[PDB]
From Swiss-Prot, chain A:
InterPro entries for this protein: DNA_clamp_sf (IPR046938), Pr_cel_nuc_antig (IPR000730), Pr_cel_nuc_antig_C (IPR022649), Pr_cel_nuc_antig_CS (IPR022659), Pr_cel_nuc_antig_N (IPR022648)
Keywords of the record: DNA replication, DNA-binding
Protein name: DNA polymerase sliding clamp 2
Keyword ATP-binding: no
Family according to the record: Belongs to the PCNA family.
Organism of origin: Saccharolobus solfataricus (strain ATCC 35092 / DSM 1617 / JCM 11322 / P2) (Sulfolobus solfataricus)
HAMAP family: DNApol_clamp_arch (MF_00317)
From Swiss-Prot, chain B:
Family: Belongs to the PCNA family.
Superkingdom per UniProt: Archaea
Job of this protein: One of the sliding clamp subunits that acts as a moving platform for DNA processing. Responsible for tethering the catalytic subunit of DNA polymerase to DNA during high-speed replication. Heterotrimer stimulates the Holliday junction resolvase Hjc. DNA polymerase I, DNA ligase and the flap endonuclease may be constitutively associated with the PCNA heterotrimer forming a scanning complex able to couple DNA synthesis and Okazaki fragment maturation.
Source organism of the structure: Saccharolobus solfataricus (strain ATCC 35092 / DSM 1617 / JCM 11322 / P2)
HAMAP family from the UniProt entry: DNApol_clamp_arch
Gene that encodes the chain: pcn1
Quaternary structure (record): Forms heterodimers with PCNA2, which then recruit PCNA3; does not form homotrimers. The heterodimers interact with RfcS homotetramers. Heterotrimer which circularizes head-to-tail (head is at N-terminus, tail is at C-terminus) to form a toroid; DNA passes through its center. Replication factor C (RFC) is required to load the toroid on the DNA. Heterotrimer interacts, probably via this subunit, with flap endonuclease 1 (fen), Hjc, Dpo4, and XPF.
MF GO annotations: DNA binding; DNA polymerase processivity factor activity
Protein known as: DNA polymerase sliding clamp 1
Keywords: DNA replication, DNA-binding
UniProtKB/Swiss-Prot annotation, chain C:
InterPro entries according to UniProt: DNA_clamp_sf (IPR046938), Pr_cel_nuc_antig (IPR000730), Pr_cel_nuc_antig_C (IPR022649), Pr_cel_nuc_antig_CS (IPR022659), Pr_cel_nuc_antig_N (IPR022648)
Gene of this entry: pcn3
Entry keyword DNA-binding: yes
Pfam families named in the record: PCNA_C, PCNA_N
Protein name in UniProt: DNA polymerase sliding clamp 3
Amino acid sequence: MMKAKVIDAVSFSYILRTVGDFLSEANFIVTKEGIRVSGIDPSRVVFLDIFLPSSYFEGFEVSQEKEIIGFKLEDVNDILKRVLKDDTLILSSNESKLTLTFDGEFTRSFELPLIQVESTQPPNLEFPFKAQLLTITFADIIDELSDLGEVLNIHSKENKLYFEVIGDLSTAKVELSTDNGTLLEASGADVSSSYGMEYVANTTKMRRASDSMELYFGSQIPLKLRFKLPQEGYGDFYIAPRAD
Amino acid sequence: MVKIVYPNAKDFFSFINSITNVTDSIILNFTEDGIFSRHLTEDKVLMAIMRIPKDVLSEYSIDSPTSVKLDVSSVKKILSKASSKKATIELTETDSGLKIIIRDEKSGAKSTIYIKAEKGQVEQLTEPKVNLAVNFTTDESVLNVIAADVTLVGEEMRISTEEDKIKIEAGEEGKRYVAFLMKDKPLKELSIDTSASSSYSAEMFKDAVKGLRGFSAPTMVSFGENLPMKIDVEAVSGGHMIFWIAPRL
Amino acid sequence: MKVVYDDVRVLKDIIQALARLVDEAVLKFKQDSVELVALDRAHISLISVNLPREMFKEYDVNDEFKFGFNTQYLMKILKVAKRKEAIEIASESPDSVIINIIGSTNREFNVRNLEVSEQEIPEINLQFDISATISSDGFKSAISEVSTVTDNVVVEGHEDRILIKAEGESEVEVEFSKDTGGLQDLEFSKESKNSYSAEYLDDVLSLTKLSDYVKISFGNQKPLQLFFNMEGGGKVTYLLAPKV
Ligand SMILES: [Br-]
Ligand SMILES: [Br-]
Ligand SMILES: [Br-]
Ligand SMILES: [Br-]
Ligand SMILES: [Br-]
Ligand SMILES: [Br-]
Ligand SMILES: [Br-]
Ligand SMILES: [Br-]
Ligand SMILES: [Br-]
Ligand SMILES: [Br-]
Ligand SMILES: [Br-]
Ligand SMILES: [Br-]
Ligand SMILES: [Br-]
Ligand SMILES: [Br-]
Ligand SMILES: [Br-]
Ligand SMILES: [Br-]
Ligand SMILES: [Br-]
Ligand SMILES: [Br-]
Ligand SMILES: [Br-]
Ligand SMILES: [Br-]
Ligand SMILES: [Br-]
Ligand SMILES: [Br-]
Ligand SMILES: [Br-]
Ligand SMILES: [Br-]
C-alpha cells in the first residue's frame, strides 16, 4: 500500500506518455526513496530509466520495503489523458488495484487492476562528450528534424554540437553552441555518431515535465538523454548507435 | 409565409448540431409560440429538444403552423462553416421545402441554402411529468469531462446523492470510476431534496452533453430515484437545448 | 546570390498552393524581383508570383538565378518555421542552394538545385467581362461552403453583385453585393456566368492569406482570375480554365 501526490499532474502525465512510446507494460518500483520505472523497447535499441524521488511528490507514504505495481501503458495513459490543466494527482495502491485520483475542479478517481509484468534492468559508462541545454531547445529542434529523415547524425567539433539529417537533394543542419546561446555548457572531444530518429523524437514530450537536460554520446556508444525533473528526478533514455 | 430570423447563426447551429447527435432527419415545428424540434433515439432512451420561443426571435411570421421534414446530413457541413457569431440566420418556407439564409456582418457574405423538405402537420411539445428531487448547475465543460471519463471505464453511469455531494460511478468489472461534485467544487448550485440514485446509458449521456459544447451558459442537470435525467441549457441568444435520458430500470 | 525575407509565413502560403498544384517549380531571382510562373500538373491553371526586392530585408541578386525545387520538399522546409522568423536563401554554386531558417536556433538546409524545364509563358493580356473585389476571407468561406456539395463552382456576375454557387442536389449561393457591403469594388462590362473546378480552387485557398481582398475576374467562356495584391508590392495571380 503506497500513496504519492504529484501537484503538477499534467507534467507527470507526459513522462508516462513518453514511456508509452517505448513500452507496452512496465512496473512502478516503489520504495521509501521514491518511484522508479525501467524498461527496454521491443526493438532492443532503447533502454529507459525514470526516477521520481519521494521529494518530487507533495506527499509520499509506503507500507512495504519494495512494492512492484505492473501496468499497461495504454491503460495508464488513457486515464492520464483525462488530466485537467490544474489537477493534482494521487497514485495509490493496494494488493489488487492501482488508483489514479485527479483533484482540482472536482475529484475524479480511476482504478486499474494490477497485472503481472516481468521485471527489467540491463548493464556505468564513460562518455567523451557532454552537453547541457534547455529541454525546449532540444524538443523544438528534434520535432523539426524528425520529419526530414530516419537517421539523426550527431557530431562535436571544438565543443560545438551538430545535429544533421542527410536527405535526397538536401541536408539539414543545426549548430549548438554556448556562443549562439543554444547550449548552457558543452565539453569534450570531437566525436561522431548516428541514431534512430524515431527513438530520439519520442522523448520530445519530456519538454512538459523537464526544463533542463543533459546530452551524452560518443563514437559507437549510446546517446544518453537525461531530462532533469524537479527535486533530483530524472528521465534517462539510452539509445543504441546505428551500425557504423 | 412561414419565416423566422434568429440573431446568432452560431448559437442556432449549436441547436441543429445537438439534435444531429440523435438524427439527421430533423423536423422543425413552426408553431404559434415559436419553433421547436424534438427527436428520440431508436431505443427511445435519449430525447433531444430544441425550443426557441418567438420573443427571443428578431423576426417571426407564421401565418399557419407547419412542420418541415429536413435531411440536414449534407447541408450541415455548410451551415457549420457559414455560421458566425456575427451572422444572423433566416429560415423561410418555399414551395419545395425550406431556405436557410445566413448574412455575415463581417465578410458581407449572404449564404442561401435551398433544401427540399416535406411539409406536415405541426406536432406537439410534451415533456415528462415527473418530480426530479435532485438539482445541480454546472457548465458544459464539467459534463464533458465526466462523459469522457465514464465512457472510457464502462457503458453504464450511476449517479447518486451522498450527503451534500453528487456521486458518479462507472465500470462493471475491474476498472472503476468515481467522481464527486459539490457546491463550489465545481457546482454553481446544488439542491438535494431527498436522497436519490439512478443509472443511465454512458453512451447516451455522452451524446447528450457533446451537443452542449456550443453553449457557454450554465447547464442544469436534474434527476430522481430511478427516474429520467434532464439536462437543460439556455443559449445566450435565447432558446433552450434540453435532453431527457431514460433510466435503466 | 543572397536574399533575406523576414516573414517565411508569406512564402509558406504561396508554396503551399504551389505544392498542391505541381511537383517542381522555379523561383527566378532577378535584379528587381523574384518571379514564379507555373502550370499545374494537368495544364488547366496558371500560378504567377512577383515579389519586388523592396519587400526583402537583404537582396543581393546581380543577375538571374534560377532556383529549381521540389515543391513538396520546399514545403517541408518552410514548415520548420512557426512564427515571425526570417528565411535566408543563398547560393555561391549554381548546383547548390543554402536555406537558413533564422530564429531561436538557425536551421540550415543545403539543397541540390534542380534543372526544371520551363516554357517561358507568353505575357498575354486578357479581357474580362467582370472584375469583382471581395474580402479574401469571404472568398475562402464561399469556396469552402460550395465545395462540400459540388465539384462545380458556378461564378455569376452582375452590375451590383458577384455570386459563388453550387447547382445540383444541394443548391447553395453565396452573394457579395452593394447592400451586404461585401463588394469592395466592381468593374462591369457584361453579365457573366461560368463554372470552374472546386478541386483546383481548393488547392489555392492558402493564397487568401496574402491580402485582405481578392480581385475576381471572369466571363462567359473566359477563365477565372484571382488577383492577390499584397501590402509590399507583392503580386500573386491564379488563372483557372473553365471546367471540363
Ligand atoms: Br501508451
Ligand atoms: Br480494490
Ligand atoms: Br521492472
Ligand atoms: Br551511464
Ligand atoms: Br570516454
Ligand atoms: Br536503430
Ligand atoms: Br509535447
Ligand atoms: Br549500446
Ligand atoms: Br401551433
Ligand atoms: Br423557451
Ligand atoms: Br458539421
Ligand atoms: Br472578411
Ligand atoms: Br398534466
Ligand atoms: Br457534437
Ligand atoms: Br450559451
Ligand atoms: Br536579372
Ligand atoms: Br518588380
Ligand atoms: Br471554411
Ligand atoms: Br474590382
Ligand atoms: Br455555368
Ligand atoms: Br488555407
Ligand atoms: Br509586384
Ligand atoms: Br494571369
Ligand atoms: Br477542370
